[PDB]
Amino acid sequence: QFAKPEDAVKYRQSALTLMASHFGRMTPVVKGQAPYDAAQIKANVEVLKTLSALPWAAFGPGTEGGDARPEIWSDAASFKQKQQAFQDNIVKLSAAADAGDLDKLRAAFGDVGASCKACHDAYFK
Amino acid sequence: QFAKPEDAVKYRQSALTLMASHFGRMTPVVKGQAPYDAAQIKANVEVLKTLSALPWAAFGPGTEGGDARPEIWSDAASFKQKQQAFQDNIVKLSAAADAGDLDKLRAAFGDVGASCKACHDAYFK
Numbered sequence: 001q002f003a004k005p006e007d008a009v010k011y012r013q014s015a016l017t018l019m020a021s022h023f024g025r026m027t028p029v030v031k032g033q034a035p036y037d038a039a040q041i042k043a044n045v046e047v048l049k050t051l052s053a054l055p056w057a058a059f060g061p062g063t064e065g066g067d068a069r070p071e072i073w074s075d076a077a078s079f080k081q082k083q084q085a086f087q088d089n090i091v092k093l094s095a096a097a098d099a100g101d102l103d104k105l106r107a108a109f110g111d112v113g114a115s116c117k118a119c120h121d122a123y124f125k
Numbered sequence: 126q127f128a129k130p131e132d133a134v135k136y137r138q139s140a141l142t143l144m145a146s147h148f149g150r151m152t153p154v155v156k157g158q159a160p161y162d163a164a165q166i167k168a169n170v171e172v173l174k175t176l177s178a179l180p181w182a183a184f185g186p187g188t189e190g191g192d193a194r195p196e197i198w199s200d201a202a203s204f205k206q207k208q209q210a211f212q213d214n215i216v217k218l219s220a221a222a223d224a225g226d227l228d229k230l231r232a233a234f235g236d237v238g239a240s241c242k243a244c245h246d247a248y249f250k
């Protein structure tokens with residue numbers, strides 16, 4: 001869906017920006033600094049679900065650019081493992097949110113954040 | 126969820142960028158220049174559904190900035206009517222996609238695009 005590589009870069013950056021707002025805006029809730037409304041969080045995690053599936057298709061072959069370390073395309077199976085592990089940790093966060101189980105939410109949130117950081121460490125310039 | 130107004134600007138711009146990729150990538154399909162796969166389009170419109178609900182919350186009071194004409198906050202009911210009409214045209218596009226009805230897709234797509242342009246004309250700098 002991208003006319004030039006720059007379009008893929010702009011798309012993924014925008015997806016990651018959201019996806020990151022929808023994750024990070026829950027930090028006060030997970031820390032207890034903001035109240036926990038199970039329905040609010042269930043709805044927000046559903047948005048995060050959808051967003052978390054979007055960036056990866058915008059790292060097609062030859063869409064090198066942005067802050068994407070070059071190691072992303074030449075090690076394709078390994079980058080895919082990281083996105084799919086991230087994506088699997090998001091399933092666990094959805095399960096916690098859907099259940100209204102705060103303790104499960106906090107644990108799952110930490111796992112998700114570790115998965116963000118793991119990819120950032122291997123693949124962000 | 127925004128620490129400063131600039132954060133809201135960055136969020137809405139990113140949401141609008143996606144939302145706009147998910148809309149515009151269907152143009153070749155609506156024109157018949159690309160094949161029509163009903164399931165593909167149903168799934169893409171579902172993504173567009175979700176995205177099309179996101180920008181509006183990032184135009185809170187005092188988040189002036191970006192390419193958002195100042196007329197957005199002082200005429201709040203009217204800006205809300207435009208986003209909700211856009212949002213209603215998206216419901217019609219979902220219905221067309223869900224039904225696998227190509228003719229209904231083309232008509233709904235044109236209505237959506239007109240709603241994008243109408244808001245762009247009243248509120249984009």
Ligand code: HEC
Pocket residue numbers: 009012013014016017019020023065066067068069072079082083086112113115116117119120123124
């Ligand atoms: C888990 C919820 C997160 C969060 C909060 C973020 N990421 Fe990543 N990310 C990855 C790569 C390769 C990039 C660079 C993209 C490019 O510039 O081409 C990024 C970038 C970001 C950003 C900045 C986006 C921007 O506006 O420029 C942010 C805010 C961000 N990330 C947060 C790679 C990955 C992953 C590889 C599988 C995973 C998982 C994540 N990121 C997860 C997260």
Ligand code: HEC
Pocket residue numbers: 134137138139141142144145148190191192193194197204207208211237238240241242244245248249
């Ligand atoms: C219907 C599907 C669309 C499409 C394809 C786009 N919009 Fe809009 N849009 C609106 C405003 C106020 C702005 C400025 C935001 C800001 O800068 O603060 C925009 C911006 C955009 C962009 C550019 C985003 C960026 O990266 O800077 C794009 C690509 C875009 N729009 C496309 C306002 C509205 C609406 C008011 C209710 C509606 C409806 C739409 N836009 C709809 C669409």
